Structure formats: C-alpha cells, structure tokens
Amino acid sequence: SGAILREVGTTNKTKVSDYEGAINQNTALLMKVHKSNFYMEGFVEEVKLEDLVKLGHKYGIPTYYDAGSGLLINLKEFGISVDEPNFRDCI
Amino acid sequence: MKSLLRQIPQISKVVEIFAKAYPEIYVVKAAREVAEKYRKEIIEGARADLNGFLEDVERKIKSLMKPNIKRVINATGVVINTNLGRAPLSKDVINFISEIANGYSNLEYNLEEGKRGSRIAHIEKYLNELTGAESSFVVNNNAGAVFLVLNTLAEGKEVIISRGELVEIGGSFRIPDIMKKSGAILREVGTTNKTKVSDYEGAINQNTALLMKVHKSNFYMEGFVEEVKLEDLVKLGHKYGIPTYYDAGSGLLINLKEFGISVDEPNFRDCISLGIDLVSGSGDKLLGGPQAGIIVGKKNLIEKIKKNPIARALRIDKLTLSGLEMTLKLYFEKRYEDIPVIRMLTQDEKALRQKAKRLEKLLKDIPGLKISVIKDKAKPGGGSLPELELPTYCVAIRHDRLSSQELSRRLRLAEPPIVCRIREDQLLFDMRTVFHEDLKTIKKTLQELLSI
RNA sequence: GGGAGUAGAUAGGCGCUGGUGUGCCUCCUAGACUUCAAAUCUACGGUCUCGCUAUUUAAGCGAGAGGUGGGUUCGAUUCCCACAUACUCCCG
C-alpha cells in the first residue's frame, strides 16, 4: 500500500494508551480491523470504538474501520443477539 | 410566513391518501422529500400555492420506485460504446450466470480433493488453449491488469515505452499516472509521431526490467508517423534478456480478418505466437464478455504476478468469472454469432438494410413522421477500433411538430430509453447495434410521444 | 451487580407519522338501527390533573401532561442527549 505500519499493543490485549502512545508527526491514520474469521477468549482487552474516535479528534487524525463483514443494519432487530458492527451505527 | 407552511399536510395524512395506492414505505419517502421542498420554497417566499403538492408527491412515488441503472436501446451504431456499457451479453451466458448466482457454487472449492481451491483455476484452462500462452491469469479489469504487471515486475526499476503510446483512455486512466502509482519508473523513448527501434534499444540499462508497448485503442495518428514492429521488440528483448509486455487493450481473442473485416488489430494467439512474454486486455471490449483484465504469457511470469499480494484486491467476482467461462466456452465451440459484439460487426451489409426497412415499415403509420433509410459510413468501434469505418443503414426520421434536438431528449427519457446520433436536424438510427425485439419497442415509444 | 439491545400515552393491546398526532383491534360509555339478539355503524369521548363558579354533593366550564429533564426546530408523539423504568440477551 505504501503506508508504513505501526503496530501497537499486544496480541490478546490492547488498551487506548497503546494507540495514543505511538502517534507523532508522521501518523496519518488510525486503523482498526474487525476480527471477522476468528476470535480470542481468555485474557483479552480491546479499545472501544468511541475511544478511538475521541483520540482521533484530539490530535486531528482520521479514523478508518475495516468492518469486513459489511453489515448494513442492526442485527439484534432480527432476533439474533450479537455485537457485530454495522455501517449506520459505526458511522 | 408561518401560515404558508402550516398548510403542508401531515405525513400520516398523505400516507392515508394513498392507502393501497402505493407502498407505505415509498409514500412516506416521497412525502418527506416533498415536505422539505415546500418548507424551503415557502421560507424563501417563492410559493403561494400548495395545490401542486398532492400531484407532486405521487410523482416522487412513481419515480422513487424505479432503479436508476436501466437497459438502454443503442441506435448509435457503435458496438463498443464506452458510455452505454460496452460489450452486451448473450442469453446463453446470462443464464449460466443466473444459475451460479442462484445459490452456492464451487467458486473457491475443488470438488475433487474436497479442500479450498483457486477460483482463477476454472478459467485459465480455456485461456491457455485459445491464446497458446504458457499460463494465464485474470483480474478485475485491464486497468488493473497493467498496474499489476508493473508493480509485479518493475516496481523500483525502469520500463521503456514509446512516447506515442502513453495514452489516456477513459476519464481516469493514464499510462503515465498509473505506472507512477505502479511503483515502476517510466522511460519514454522516441517522439509523438515517430519511434524507431533504435529509440527502444538506446534507453536500456541495468535498471531496465521491462519493455512495454501500449496499443492506441481510442485514437490514431496519420501523416508522418513511425511505429516499432512487434517482431522487432521481441528480437530486442531476447537480445538483452528483457521481457516484453503488450497491452492490447482491445482484448481481441481471434484473428479478425477471418470474418470479412480487414484490419491489423492484434490478438492474443497471434501476439503470443510472436514471441511476446506477456499480453493483456479487457474482456468487455473485443472479446465480448464481462469486464475482466486478461493476462497470458510465460508461466514463470504468471506465477510472479499471481503471488503478488495485490492480486487479491483485483481478483474477479463470482458473476464475471462464471459469465467469462461461458463466453470462453462459446469461443471453443466456434459459436461466433452467439457473442453480440462479433455478430454486430460481421453482419451482412444486406443484413442491415433488411432490418433498416423492417423498422420503417413499423413507423409509416405514426402521425407526422418523415421516414427515410440512408446508407451511411460510420465508425463502429468506440473503445477498441479507432480507424475502422464500415457501411451501415440508418433510418433517418423527422417530425413536423418537434425538432431533432428535443426528440433525442424525450427518447432518452422513455421506458425503455433510446440513445441516438444527430446530424443536421435529422435523428439517425444505426441498425448495426439494434436488436430485433427492439423494433417493436421503438414504434411503441415513438407513437406515445407524438400522439399523446 | 456490570454491559448492551428492544421501549414508552393522555381508557386498554399493536403499528405509524417533523404538520400540533394518527390507523387497526379491543374495552367502556353513549347514540343510531334492528320484532328479540346478533351484527353494524359512529365518538375534536375517555386517563390523570389542576384550576374556576357553586361548594355537602351534585352541577357547568376552562387548561396541560407522551417515563423525567433538556435541545433542535416555524412546529417534536416523531429526531438528539441525559437520567430513570419495563422486557430481554452476555458476562462476575
């Protein structure tokens, strides 16, 4: 892609501090990918989406979410209870 | 001010006005859109009447219930019409696509071994046979086909190309601008109108990783002009040990002189059997199939391209893949007439008048219509054959009431819509591109605009 | 207990709508009609409340609330936010 990759946190856990800590003059993007075809249980921490946006608007950095699943609507409306994100809500 | 807007009814109230008239969903959408257009028009003080409301709300409903993309009756006589969606598909293909999309299929699944398999594997069997190349591959479109070969084999290294072959096809594609983003360094040789072989051979060096030639598909040069022969560039490559990459663009799968049309347009089989290492082209041009970037050439190169992590972002969808296999199946069976684009251009001169006057027989009754059939020479190829000029019968029409300009306008707004040429206040209908079942739809749309 | 989702009336259950709310079904009461019953139909109807005249009560009349509060807006039942509550789903 031509973009330089700055990986923060660790496999199972990643707090907000990890993101905010690696920012600098070259940081042009804050990107989060949704684990679509796998999942981690046990000691595992993740950064709330709301917090990423807050961190972006603080330093003036754009936020890019690769949902992957491409869920167009809220899924709970159909009886299936999952936290799967969707465009409308994430936007 | 605040009384010229209180007027506008309630969305619950207009929803009622259309009980079974239209779906509740489409009604509320039209009411909102309409409710906002009257709030702003009265706020700026440009409306004193609201009677237009009820009539309008129903027009939005009638409009909002139709998809935007719509089949269009092409009367221009241009087979590869970049604007109208290039090469149209035969029913045979469209049903093969219909079936694979209906449910699950073995897209990335090899039924033999019961484990995942490459989806590009189904087709390539066909390409290698038809072209004669060692191996093949296919991606989204030729634009990307180019970008992939450059970033695969010339990222960071030089690529020599003639200064007369740096094209701008389409609105966003430009060899110089994409190759840049390709990571390859551009070495332009020769001059606009002329380019000998010495120009190519002169700019080679330690970084030269590719010799690339682009086919001027959407333009041509006449007058004092020189070009580098293909056999020459193959010779030059094999001398210094440099690969040859031809961007045919037209994606002509076969020799074209075999069908009566005499042109020099290059084709895969012939260009491959010439000594070129790689060749690419769009599937929706001279191949007559769905949009697809087609690459054929040496195996050691194809494998280098495939492994590139960018090929996954170009890998073709389930629709075009299937639809491309059935298009390729037709080519093996020599069912040439079955593929729209080949039939349209190789149609009998006799064949065209036969349809030219079968339409004129359907419009003699319609009121105020001045119908005449003229033999005109047009240029069929839009995105692949720039110089070609072939004879075809146009049924030139003219109404006393309305003018040619206004006529084209209403015809593009019809259902189905019809797009046609205009020449000296005489609307023209080239029969080279008109399907038979359209003739009946042509007459029924013209009688609805001049007698209404 | 911690999160999250679905949510909301001013007779009662469901659904809708940026036009000052409304449609379907039910209840109640009332009216119409019907030999009797049913059916049917209709209601700027209903709750709470407060206030006003009388004031034991009756009796007549007027107004506001949509879980609560706030905001946007010409107008919020609709939309945003905050807190509360109901139902459900996940975790300790």
From Swiss-Prot, chain B:
GO biological process, one term: selenocysteine incorporation
Class of the enzyme per the UniProt entry, highest EC level: transferase
E.C. code: 2.9.1.1
Cofactor: pyridoxal 5'-phosphate
GO-annotated molecular function: identical protein binding; L-seryl-tRNA(Sec) selenium transferase activity
GO CC term, one of those recorded: cytoplasm
Domain of life of the native organism: Bacteria
InterPro entries assigned to the protein according to its UniProt record, in alphabetical order: PyrdxlP-dep_Trfase (IPR015424), PyrdxlP-dep_Trfase_major (IPR015421), SelA-like (IPR018319), SelA_trans (IPR004534)
Compartment(s): Cytoplasm
Reaction catalyzed: L-seryl-tRNA(Sec) + selenophosphate + H(+) = L-selenocysteinyl-tRNA(Sec) + phosphate
Keywords: Cytoplasm, Protein biosynthesis, Pyridoxal phosphate, Selenium, Transferase
Keyword Cytoplasm: yes
Involved pathway(s): Aminoacyl-tRNA biosynthesis; selenocysteinyl-tRNA(Sec) biosynthesis; selenocysteinyl-tRNA(Sec) from L-seryl-tRNA(Sec) (bacterial route): step 1/1
Coiled coil spans: none
Modified residues (N6-(pyridoxal phosphate)lysine): 285
Entry function: Converts seryl-tRNA(Sec) to selenocysteinyl-tRNA(Sec) required for selenoprotein biosynthesis.
UniProt record similarity statement: Belongs to the SelA family.
Name of the protein in its database record: L-seryl-tRNA(Sec) selenium transferase
Gene symbol of the encoding locus: selA
